Structure formats: structure tokens, C-alpha cells
Amino acid sequence: NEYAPLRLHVPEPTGRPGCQTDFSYLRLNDAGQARKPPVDVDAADTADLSYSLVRVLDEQGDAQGPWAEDIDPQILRQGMRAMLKTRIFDSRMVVAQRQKKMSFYMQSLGEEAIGSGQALALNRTDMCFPTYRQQSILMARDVSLVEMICQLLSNERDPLKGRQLPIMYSVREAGFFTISGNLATQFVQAVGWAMASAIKGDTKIASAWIGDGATAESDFHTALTFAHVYRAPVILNVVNNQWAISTFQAIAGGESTTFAGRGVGCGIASLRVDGNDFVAVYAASRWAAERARRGLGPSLIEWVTYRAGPHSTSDDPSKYRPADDWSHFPLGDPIARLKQHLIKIGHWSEEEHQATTAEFEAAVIAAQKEAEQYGTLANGHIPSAASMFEDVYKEMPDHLRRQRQEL
Amino acid sequence: NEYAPLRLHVPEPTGRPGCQTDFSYLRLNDAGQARKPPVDVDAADTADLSYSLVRVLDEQGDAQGPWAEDIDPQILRQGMRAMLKTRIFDSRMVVAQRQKKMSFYMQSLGEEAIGSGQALALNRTDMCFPTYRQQSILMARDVSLVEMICQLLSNERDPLKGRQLPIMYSVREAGFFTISGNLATQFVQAVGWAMASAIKGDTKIASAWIGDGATAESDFHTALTFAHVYRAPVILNVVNNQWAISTFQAIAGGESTTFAGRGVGCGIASLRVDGNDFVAVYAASRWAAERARRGLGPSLIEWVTYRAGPHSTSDDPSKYRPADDWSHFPLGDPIARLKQHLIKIGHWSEEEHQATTAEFEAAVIAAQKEAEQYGTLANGHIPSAASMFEDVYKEMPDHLRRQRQEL
Amino acid sequence: ATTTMTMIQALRSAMDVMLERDDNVVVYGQDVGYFGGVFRCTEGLQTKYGKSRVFDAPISESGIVGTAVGMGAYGLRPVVEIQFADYFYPASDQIVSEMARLRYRSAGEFIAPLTLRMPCGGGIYGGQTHSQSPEAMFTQVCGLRTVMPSNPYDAKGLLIASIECDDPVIFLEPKRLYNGPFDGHHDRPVTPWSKHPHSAVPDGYYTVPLDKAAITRPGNDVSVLTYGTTVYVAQVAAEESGVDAEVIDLRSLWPLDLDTIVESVKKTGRCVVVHEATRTCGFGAELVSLVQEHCFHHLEAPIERVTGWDTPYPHAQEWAYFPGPSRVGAALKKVMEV
Amino acid sequence: ATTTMTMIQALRSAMDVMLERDDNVVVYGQDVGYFGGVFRCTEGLQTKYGKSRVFDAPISESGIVGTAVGMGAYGLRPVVEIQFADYFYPASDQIVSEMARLRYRSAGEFIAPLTLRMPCGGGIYGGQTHSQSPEAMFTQVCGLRTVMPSNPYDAKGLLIASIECDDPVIFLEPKRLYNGPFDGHHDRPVTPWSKHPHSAVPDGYYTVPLDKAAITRPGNDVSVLTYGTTVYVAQVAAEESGVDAEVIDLRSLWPLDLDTIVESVKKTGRCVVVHEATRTCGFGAELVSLVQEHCFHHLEAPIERVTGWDTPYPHAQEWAYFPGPSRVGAALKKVMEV
Ligand SMILES: Cc1ncc(C[n+]2csc(CCOP(=O)(O)OP(=O)(O)O)c2C)c(N)n1
Ligand SMILES: Cc1ncc(C[n+]2csc(CCOP(=O)(O)OP(=O)(O)O)c2C)c(N)n1
Ligand SMILES: *C(CC(C)C)C(=O)O
Ligand SMILES: *C(CC(C)C)C(=O)O
Ligand SMILES: [Mg+2]
Numbered sequence A, B: 001n002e003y004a005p006l007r008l009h010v011p012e013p014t015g016r017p018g019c020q021t022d023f024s025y026l027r028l029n030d031a032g033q034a035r036k037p038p039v040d041v042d043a044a045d046t047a048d049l050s051y052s053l054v055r056v057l058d059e060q061g062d063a064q065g066p067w068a069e070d071i072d073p074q075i076l077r078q079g080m081r082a083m084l085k086t087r088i089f090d091s092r093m094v095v096a097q098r099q100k101k102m103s104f105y106m107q108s109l110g111e112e113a114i115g116s117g118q119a120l121a122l123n124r125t126d127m128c129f130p131t132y133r134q135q136s137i138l139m140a141r142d143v144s145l146v147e148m149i150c151q152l153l154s155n156e157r158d159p160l161k162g163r164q165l166p167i168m169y170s171v172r173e174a175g176f177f178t179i180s181g182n183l184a185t186q187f188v189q190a191v192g193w194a195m196a197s198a199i200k201g202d203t204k205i206a207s208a209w210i211g212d213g214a215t216a217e218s219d220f221h222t223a224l225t226f227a228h229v230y231r232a233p234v235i236l237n238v239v240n241n242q243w244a245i246s247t248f249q250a251i252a253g254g255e256s257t258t259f260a261g262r263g264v265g266c267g268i269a270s271l272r273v274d275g276n277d278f279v280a281v282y283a284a285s286r287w288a289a290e291r292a293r294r295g296l297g298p299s300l301i302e303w304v305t306y307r308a309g310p311h312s313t314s315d316d317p318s319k320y321r322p323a324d325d326w327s328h329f330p331l332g333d334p335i336a337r338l339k340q341h342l343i344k345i346g347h348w349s350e351e352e353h354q355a356t357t358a359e360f361e362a363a364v365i366a367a368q369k370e371a372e373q374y375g376t377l378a379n380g381h382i383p384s385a386a387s388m389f390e391d392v393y394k395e396m397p398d399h400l401r402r403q404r405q406e407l
Numbered sequence C, D: 001a002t003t004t005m006t007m008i009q010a011l012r013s014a015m016d017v018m019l020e021r022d023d024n025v026v027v028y029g030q031d032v033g034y035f036g037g038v039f040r041c042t043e044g045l046q047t048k049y050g051k052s053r054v055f056d057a058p059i060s061e062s063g064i065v066g067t068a069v070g071m072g073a074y075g076l077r078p079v080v081e082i083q084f085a086d087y088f089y090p091a092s093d094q095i096v097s098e099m100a101r102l103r104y105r106s107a108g109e110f111i112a113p114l115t116l117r118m119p120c121g122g123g124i125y126g127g128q129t130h131s132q133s134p135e136a137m138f139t140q141v142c143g144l145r146t147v148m149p150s151n152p153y154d155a156k157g158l159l160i161a162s163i164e165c166d167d168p169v170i171f172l173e174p175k176r177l178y179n180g181p182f183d184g185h186h187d188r189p190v191t192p193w194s195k196h197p198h199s200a201v202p203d204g205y206y207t208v209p210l211d212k213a214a215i216t217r218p219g220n221d222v223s224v225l226t227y228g229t230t231v232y233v234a235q236v237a238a239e240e241s242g243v244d245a246e247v248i249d250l251r252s253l254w255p256l257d258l259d260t261i262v263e264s265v266k267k268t269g270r271c272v273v274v275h276e277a278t279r280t281c282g283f284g285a286e287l288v289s290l291v292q293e294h295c296f297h298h299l300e301a302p303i304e305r306v307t308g309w310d311t312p313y314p315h316a317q318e319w320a321y322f323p324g325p326s327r328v329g330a331a332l333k334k335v336m337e338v
């Protein structure tokens, strides 16, 4: 009588196949509009920033605002090289996935700027805790394409000796922590790594990563909690590409809210940045690296981007979202926007773009050929079967020895 | 050189044994200063409220502000009865714990107003998901003292048949969900119960509870996430009594922040209320019950109180905090403050106070005597041993039958 | 009537039947809604019954099981999914500490009539977090009911039966058998279900009793205790060894059909346990411990078990890990030896 | 020199020794800091070594283990606590999915030299979440090392040894044996450690090799496989039955000392497994499965196991659940029967 029946609320995206997504839900801001706080700012004073957008490059490719300060063109060129290299390697590996030379692959189309940008603002000794979509970091740190590909093929030359799924890289030498298929776990572990550094009076920092979907995972909350309680020197990165497989970010709790705002609520200085604006990504990352290294505490950064391609080689975006989606995304293509800006300021040209593109293609084709010489899925050429019982423990316990001989 | 050694930050309370706690960390507000929003307010507009304090009764016992509206004295008298009954039962059971008639007990000294206040603002059919410290709810819903005590003794009359630890009550008839020793788990389950009600077009709501310490538990975050995503009809209560056993709330992430503010960050309308101000507890609870029942979404309420007594009968506060602490707490004693206000407005008297006190004492002593007639720890009079294999599954599977006969 | 379905299609039918048979039945999990699941197991279910019945959930296992527990407390019958069994861990506490002990600790006041479907099993180049078999993490939990089918027909019946059971049910689904049977031969491309036994599934309601195992290949030589993909591996391995081994597909891991098992080993006089899961403290350790108790004298040889090695599931060395027709067959001989 | 300590005091000494011996050793958990732990196991450690070495942590198991994993990745040796073994579940994912497989999946690049101390065991009116024995949830995890002491001396050595091991170690601590030995007799008030064997503990550094069991009561009649509180229950139960049973305290659940065990049953010809944990798929199921493999012929009777019932730990019926000198003793006869 008095009270109407309660009803369940299930968020739905504005655009489904055969429709057009209305990207209004994004709380966007124009370039230069957001201010650049001191690196010692208090968490609470970052509230407004957590619900806005830090963006440098405008519609015309011009740098606007306070975040545009002190930006060396040489770092942007290395950036472009990093973004192009990531996208080209990505394309090539999907093809190799189709031609069954490979078992599985995941692209980072449209997100190449985020990991490459932050990598360049940190030191190689700064350890990153990436998910499966930050290969851009490895590229920015010039990791061997041959070793990466071998791992994607599980060759006899696979640095992981076939023990792990393709793209589940591990490169300690490049401050790239062993990836795990379990979502979010690396977020909290990164805080521990930072706590370890503070405990030892060191100056190295941690760079943690997680996608919008995984934020709903328990370890996201745990990470913020420990980061705040111990004032850990970690940069907590949330890559909001609007999706987690087939689920729109609203079902992750993004409706009427932002992911950066969650840092503010847990006492962490937070920033919501344009993830497809390289300059903005390098500047905001540098900002957070400095806050941490100075012992001013952790930082939470929400990167607003868009997952341009399939979730993986096993996914089909056409079954849940518009196929023309990326075309309407208000923040566009990271590589296209840096290209426009770089050219307009006299530090890049259509000529360099094509030439640099041609060399990464050759580099990738050569690397693939170089790696294949050690095996494929066809060629039974893979790691030994006895190496399969190694490293489970520091020293092969008796029971494993038995199982090895029994093979 | 350039960067000074990073250092680990470990929060410490201002007061340790042999010192005096400086309660300045509490972001308190004077009575009436906080406004009373419409029940349809947007989550984001509750930001300021999440970092303030809703309080009615002032230093002199006078009701101030908008939250004082529509408050029936009869509800306060039932409140006082509920608070007195809880504190008196609490005292009595600690004694019975010492005289080894009982195995274990936990007090709610200083927190009696929170659970009793909310219980009275809800309907009996509204299901509560309490921790181990909301016995005040059972008292407000007039649950048999004899059955409660039997469970605390594990008698042959124990409604739980000895299967559970003392105070791990379960009273479905009184909308009091089976307590679990595992912290936080009930918080998320309460959201499910609410989701169930919305799914069925019902009008019943959930009342979830959790302490400051447990908020760091994964299920706290999970609860807020699902509550927000599905707009669940649940009241998410956080009882901040400043401690979790020996740990000061700062180590739970409370430094420079509030627990209510975490609701704001997750898209939930939040309220930080004086937990020792009964009127404020009834008003804020009624407010949240209404928002939920009207389908306007969940609510998060941080109750600022203080754990007056030991964590349990196995704890010793003298080893980690000032023994004179409660004496300086700015928000005082819930029973003392309601007593002052109630008398000043002509609906309570020193006479009624003592008389009502005397009857609950008799009621408790009689109940204890009534319950003991069914067993104690001394008297081997307890539930059968064959009832021990019951209810593990709906129907005793073969293996258990075997184990039963084998006894 | 009847229609030919794959396991995916069978399970989908079961949920379709129950969602229609019991207003209290609810389905939800990651990508289960609009998309229909990463394995298509819930296709069109939301379109047909609505958002309030079938819907997508945040990436939170504990949250998925936790809210389901609270849902059951209210009075609903939640059928919830966990994309991969490898990812159930975050929901460990809610599963063990809550779901299992709900009925016991409340003396029947509150119950958890929940069903948790989790794709499991290897043999697909899944890797460490894409193909483990955690059955042993559940069966040791007092209060749970672990089930695992091996074919379309059984898949539907055991699901419909698992759903209706008033006890919390951990419904394991072998992804390897989703599209068709698999004997363990990667050389011989695999075939669908429409060209194999047990793909004939009734369109409406029907069940397959829990606590009841099933003999796949009647034999007198050796008793073969298994379930899931290794069912078809034991059948073929038996045909290769020639051994007239009796293949028993428990179907219900625990509680299990203790009689049909003690009865086949009583006759036979010897048994071999086969499951994908790692060895040490795997489920196979309980099967062995019970056989040795109710069949000590009638036992004509040491009980053997062919399982996965005590190592995380590799990607490259896939076929070296998975207990195929070969490594298994070898076992069928080692036991028939004097 | 040497001093007389209780288990609590022994464990405290071990951490005190290591915290002093290795700059990379860190101790933290709920109430472990200023307070010194809800069991006093870390008393004064923070006062002596500082906040940066020993400190209090938020109530988050997953967070405690997770940050510890990241800490080990950096290069630290984290000794972390979980107030009660009953509350490890929230850290399941980090323990299984991360800590255990860290070395394997990274090919040695990153390691988890962590130690997780968890009070376990019943016999104290703890209830369902205050006295379970989850050893079986760990031993089935490829990559872990499960240890459980039974007396002050061993408690220190195995901790110091567990800490230094470069493999993740789950260090179970029987709360029942914290203050003194316990045979299972609640009538006879229990005594401290200063009035019993093995309470003499060295003040400085020393160890007790892992993977090495230990005979408590040399016998020729029956082999008794146990650990923890049931060690003292097997000793007394043997004295009551009169049975000259050989009591073996594994000390290391897994990996375990397969030889010292197969050797005692080889001689004896019969063994009985005793542990508090529930039955089905408990650790006792693996012990039984190995004994039946390496001692099939030399076996002169069905292997028996006395454990907790397949039910959640009750409060009132405490003594009816716990496998005391009685229910155990009965087993020592059932096996010695023809
Ligand atoms: C604990 C856990 N649950 C489920 C999965 C299956 N899963 C893999 S990727 C994925 C999507 C996560 O998306 P998001 O965090 O947004 O990252 P993105 O894929 O967009 O980079 C899911 C649900 C998993 N790997 N781990
Ligand atoms: C998952 C889990 N970890 C640890 C414990 C042990 N424990 C019991 S009560 C408690 C304190 C929690 O405090 P808080 O949430 O502030 O509640 P309060 O005791 O103050 O009412 C702890 C750590 C537990 N019960 N469950
Ligand atoms: C498998 C592997 C990686 C996370 C894509 C999955 O769970 O999707
Ligand atoms: C035990 C029982 C209850 C939570 C006090 C504990 O963990 O403290
Ligand atoms: Mg994403």
C-alpha cells in the first residue's frame, strides 16, 4: 500500500550492437582546465580533481594548461616510438595467433600511451606490477622482442620454460614483475614492494596496475588500505577502458562515480587523467613518481581510455557493444593525437612516422622469424618435460624427483 | 643524494597506558550544526556530511537542529529501557563468565544506543546482519533472556544445541541473522538479502553491521560495490568505537579520513552520526530506512562511539590504552545523555531510572536462574552428542550416520 | 520430446528449465547476462527471463557467493557462476566459513540452497590459472556437495538435481568436454557430441540422482574410479591395454556412491584412481583411503592412482602433464601384474 | 646458555633470534606490534627492534600475505601472522595463486621466502571459528611447505628453520600446547611446560631440520602417525591400551619424512593415523594413501585413522569431538586384532 514494490537495478550501457554509444557518462574536461597541484598536496584537496580530467593536448593538437610545463620533445619521440612499437607488435602477434603459430594473445589497441608514458617517467629500478595489458611498458624499456615472442610460443627458448600462458611475461631486469592470471593480486603486492623499499631506507618506488573491472576485486581495496595506512611509495594506476570483457564499467560501480574518487575516500591523493594524451600521461606520472620518491605518500591515478580492440583473441566485441564505438570515443587515438601535436611543434613529420613504422615492422618480422627458429606450436620443439618439475620449490623435494623419473 | 631515504609510516594512538588520549582526531561537530538532507539526496551531495557529525543532544541535554524533528518520547523510553537492559545483561554475564558458569562473553558498554536505536526505527521483518556486539538489537526486539542465556551456557536448552560459541546468537524470528566468527562476511550477505527483496518486489530491507577494524576486510568493499551497482535496499552501518581489540582505528585507515567518506567514494549516500546520541541514532536510522524502503538506494552510516569496556572477557585494555579513556571521550555515555535529556523534557525521572534498573536486574537474575536449570559448564547437562551430526546437510549423509553409530 | 545438445547446450537447458520451474531461481555472474557467458552457457536466458532473473555481476567472487548466501537466507535459490574454477579462491571464506556452515550453526533457521558452477579441467593449453581441478578444496569441506558431469545428458540432470538440492552444491563443469568428448588424443582432431553416445537430451524437466555413481565400461579385471574428462580417458586406455577394466564415473565426488564402488572392487579385487588434479592430498587420496578400509582383504594388489603431477599446470608441456590414454593405460597393466 | 620456556616463549625467542640475525626479517600482523599479539607470542619485539621491523597491521589477511609477497619480491624475509588459522581463508588466493607459484611461474626471478604463523587446533571450547585444523588446505598446494611443532624446543628450531627456508612456509602453531602439554584429559587440570620433557630451550640460534619426522614413543606393535596435540594423546593412549605403539610426530606435514615413516611401518606391520582435522579428504587421507603404496605387503591389517568427525567444531560437545586418549586408544586395539 504505502510502499511501492522494491526493484532490482541492473546498469546497462547506452550502446549495444546496432546502436550508438552515448559517451556522455564520461565526466570529461577540456585541455588545461584542471590545475596541477603541488606534489605535497593533501589527499582531501584532490577531491575535485578526482571527478574531473587532466588533459593537455586539445582538439587542434595544442598543449594547454599547467601540466604542459617542462616537457622534453625527446621524451615524446621515445614515447611515439614506444606506442608505435607496441601497436605494431600487437597487430603482428594477432596474425600469428590466427595462423595458429601461437596459442593466445591480447592487444592493447588504444591504450599504448598509458604504460609507455609512465615507464618513461620512472626509473628502470622502479618495479612495475602490471596486468596483462601493459606490454607498452616492456617496449618503452626496450626489452628483447625475440625473448618476448619466444615466451608467446613456448619455445625451447621460452624464458619461462613453457610453464606459463602466452603474454604472462616476467622481466625482473626491466622492473616488470611476473604477471599472474589472477586479477588484482598484483595491486596489493606492489604496495608490499613499496613498503619493503621504505623499510630499507631505499629510494625506489612501485608502479601498480589494474583495470576498471578488477577494481571490484578484493585486493583493490586492500591495496588502497595498506597504501594509506603505511604511506607507501606506490603509484596506484587504474586503467578505465570502459570495459572488462563484455561488461561495461558501470557494472564495476562506475555509475555516477569515478575510480579516482575512491582514492580520495581512502585518504589517497588521486588524479583522473586523459589516458590517450601522452603528454598528460607523462606529466601526471612524473608528478606521482615525485610525490612517492619524496616520501609524500602514494597516489591513485584513473586513466580514462578505451579498449579499442577485442578483449583477447577469444573475444567478439560485436556481440555486446557497437563495432563503430572507438570511432566516436571523445578522447580518440593516442598515436594519432601525439602525431598531430608533435608535428605542429616541429619534432615529428609524416616522413618520420612512416619510416619509424617501417622499421618496427621489420624488427617485429625479424624477431618473429628469429624466435620461430626455436619452435612453434607445430614444431614439437618446446622446453623439456623434466624442466617441468623444477622451481616448484628451491630444491626438488623427493616426491617430485620420483615423479620426474616416473616420466 | 637528491632523495632522502624513504621511511615506513606506522600510525600510533595519541594515548598509551600512563598517558592521556588526545581525542582531537575525531572530526566532531556541535549539535544541530549538520543539516538533514532529503531522503532522495544524491550520494555526491553527502560528501560534506561524510566528514562532519550528525548530533542532536547538546552539552545541556537539549535537542538542537533539523534532526530533532518528529521524535516521539515513547520511542525514547523504549530506547532507555533497551539501553539499560543491554548494559545490565552485559554486566551480569561478565560476572557469570568469571564464576566460570560461562565460557566466554563480550560487552557493548558505551555502544548500547546504536543497535537499539536502529532496531526501533525498522520493522521486525527488516532483517539485521549483526556482528557480535549488537545484542542491543535483541533487547530492543524483546527476545527471551532465557533463550539467550541458554545459548551462552550451551545447555540442553541451547537453541543452537551447543554447536556455536557463546554470543554467536541466531534469532530469525527477531530478524537477527546467525552470527559468524568470521569478520565482515555478513556485510556483503546483507546486500544479497536486500537484492533478494528487490528481486521479489518486496518492501523489506536489510540492516548490515561491521566495526571499524573489520572495514579493512575484503567483504566491506564488496558490500559497498554490490550495494551501489544494484541500488540495494540496505543500511550499511559502520560502528567506529575507535578500536579493534588492541588496534587504534588509525591502523584501519582512519587517519585524516572518516569511514562514512568511503561510502561517498563508492556512490553511496553517507552519514557520520554521534553514536552515543540516541535521538540522533533513531533519526538517522529512520532516515536511512525510509530512503531504502522507498527504493532510493542504500545508505552508509558511520557511528562514532567508543568501546568502553574490554574487547572481550579475554582482553586487557590496560595493556594498550589509557584506563581513564572513556572518562574523557567527548561524546560520553549514551545512557547518561538520554537520561539528562529525557528528564529535562518531562518524560523520565530519577525514580523511573532506578525502578526500571531494578526490574531488569531481577529479570536478568531470574532468567539466569531459569536458564541454569538446564545446565552449566559444571553440570555436564548439555546438548546430546548425536545432535552434533545433525544439520550439516539437510539429510544426514551416510558417512555421518556411520560416524554417529561409531559414537 | 528430445534434442541433440552439447554440454554447453545441456547446462543451458537445465537453467532454462529451472528458471522457468522455480520463481526463486536466479542466475548471475561475470558476463553471464547480456553476453550469455564466456562459454555461451547462459545464452538468451536474460532475454527470455529478464534482468531481475539473469544478470551480469562485478568481478568479485566473494561478492558473488556472499550476496548469494544472503539471497538464500531470504529464500531464493541462487545458481551462480565463477568463469574459471581457478578463480574461486577469492570466495574461499564465503564458501567454507559461511555457505557450508549456514544450516548447521543456525540449527536450520537459515539455509544455503545455492549452486556454484565452475568450469574446470585442463587439456586445452589453458596454463596455470586456466585449467586446474580444485575439487579437493571442496570435498574436505563439511557441508558441501561436490558434483561433476561427463556428458550432455548427465550434465543437465545433475544440474537440475544439484539446483533443487537444499544443500550448497559446487557444480564442476569440465570445459574440455564442453564441445565434445575427449579421450586424450590431441593428434586425432576431436569430434562434437552429435556423433557420440549420450548427446540425446530431453527438452523438459528431468533429473539424475546425486550420490549415485555410474559404470561406464563393465569389467571384471580392474575397478577404475574417475570423473570428468578422465572418464573417456579410462575407457580408451582400457581398450588399448585390452584390460577388461570397469570404468566408474562417480558423478558425485562427495558425498559419493560408496556402495557402487566398494561393490565393483569387491568383485574385481583391484582398482585404479584417475583424475586431473595434482597428486598429494588430491581427492584421489580419499578414494584410496576408503577402498583400503572397506576392501582390504578382497584387495589383490596395491591401489594405484594416475593423476596430474605435483606441479602447476604448464602450457607448453600440456600433453606431458595431462594423464592421457598412455600414462593411464600403463597403470592398467602395472596393477594386473603379479 | 639455556632457559625454560613455554611454546609461546619459544616461538617468541625464534623471532627474536632471526629479527636479530637477518636484517631482512620482518614481523607483522593483527595486534602483533605494541600489544605483542593476542597470545603474547611477539612481546617486546617491537620495543626492541622498532616499528619498521615489528608492527601492527589492518584486519586484512589477503592484504597481510599480499604485501608480504611483494615484500619478498623486493628481497625481504616476512614472518607474518594470522590470529587464528580459522581466518586464513580471506588470504586463500594470495597463498595459493601467488605465494606458492611465485618461484615456478617466474623461473626463479622472484621468490617468496615467507613464513605464515597460524594458531590452530581445538580442545579449548573455541567453537567453529576458534579451533579448526586447515592443514589439508595447504598440503595439497604445490609450492608450499607445511610445518607443525609439538613442544617448546621443536617450536623454536622449526620456526627458525622455517623462516630461513627459501620456500613459502605455513607454520601451524597448536594453541592447545601454548602453555603446556595436553594429553586430552580435561578432568586432570593441565600442567605448564617447566614440569615436562622438552621445555629446555637454548637462548641463541639453533635449528630443527625440516623434512625430518621424529619418534616419540619407540614401539614394535603399531606405527602411530601424528602431529601437534595428538602427539601427546597418542603417547598416553598407548600407555592406556598398553600397546607398544610407535608414536611418530611428523613435525613436517608436507613435504614429509617418507622414510622414517615407511621404515616404522615396515618393521611394525601396522599403522594408525591421528589428527584433529575433519576426516574426509583430511591430511590423514594422503598419509594412508602413501602407506598403502610403499607398505602394501608388509601390512598386517587395514590402516586406521582416528580424527575429528565430519562436522564443524562444536562448543558444548567439545570433548565428544576431540579425539581423546579414549577414542584413540580404542583404535590401538582394533588394529592389534586378528
Ligand atoms: C579473480 C579472477 N576472476 C575472473 C577472471 C577472468 N577475467 C579475466 S580478464 C577479465 C576482465 C577484467 O577486466 P578489466 O579489469 O577491465 O581489464 P581489461 O581486460 O579491460 O584490461 C576477467 C573477468 C580472472 N582472470 N581472475
Ligand atoms: C577474518 C577474521 N580475522 C581476524 C579475526 C579475529 N578478530 C576478532 S574480533 C577482532 C576485532 C575487530 O574489531 P572491530 O571490527 O573494530 O570490532 P569490535 O571488536 O570493535 O566491535 C579481530 C581482529 C576474526 N574474527 N576474523
Ligand atoms: C585467462 C588468462 C588471462 C587473464 C586472459 C582469463 O581468466 O581470462
Ligand atoms: C573469536 C570469536 C569472536 C569473533 C570474538 C575471535 O576471533 O576473536
Ligand atoms: Mg578494463
Ligand SMILES: [Mg+2]
Residues within 6 Å of the ligand: B211, B212, B213, B239, B240, B241, B242, B243, B244, B307
Ligand atoms: Mg571497533
